[PDB]
Amino acid sequence: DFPVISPFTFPTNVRLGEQVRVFCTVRRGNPPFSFAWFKEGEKLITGQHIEVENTDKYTSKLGILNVSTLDIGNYTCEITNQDGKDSATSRLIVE
């Protein structure tokens, strides 16, 4: 079965300095999965103000603390298992 991400969206009224957490979760498909987050095209990993964390076998969290205008942009989660891949995106707008 080909894996499929449940669409995600950032909150709609994000202001400077808030924390933002979004979740990339698999609705169809069997683990184990790889989860990868990208901002535009660069791979994101835990560090600075960012957290990228597997929450359960079906889910990856992206957390962004003390959000700034520099955090505005398109964020993509890619999930991959032995049977295929899927990708979901959403745009973070601040202030």
Residue numbers in the entry: 1 to 95
Paper passage:
Furthermore, the cis interactions were established by the three FNIII domains of sDscam, which assemble into a cross fold with a kink between FNIII2 and FNIII3.
We also determined the crystal structures of sDscam Ig1 from another chelicerate species Limulus polyphemus (isoforms α7 and β3v7) to provide insights into the conservation of sDscam trans recognition within Chelicerata. These crystal structures of Ig fragments were determined at 1.3–3.1 Å resolutions. The crystal structures of sDscam Ig1 from both M. martensii and L. polyphemus revealed a common assembly of antiparallel homodimer for both α and β subfamilies of sDscam. Similarly, sDscam Ig1 also employs the ABED face to form an antiparallel homodimer. However, among the seven Ig1 structures reported here, the complementary electrostatic potential surface pattern (negative in one end, neutral in the middle, and positive in the other end) has been only observed in the three β isoforms, but not in any one of the four α isoforms. Structural analysis showed that B and E strands constituted the core of ABED face and dominated the trans homophilic interactions of sDscam Ig1. Electrostatic and shape complementarity had been observed in all Ig1 dimer interfaces. The electrostatic repulsion and/or shape non-complementarity may avoid the binding between different sDscam isoforms, resulting in isoform-specific interactions.
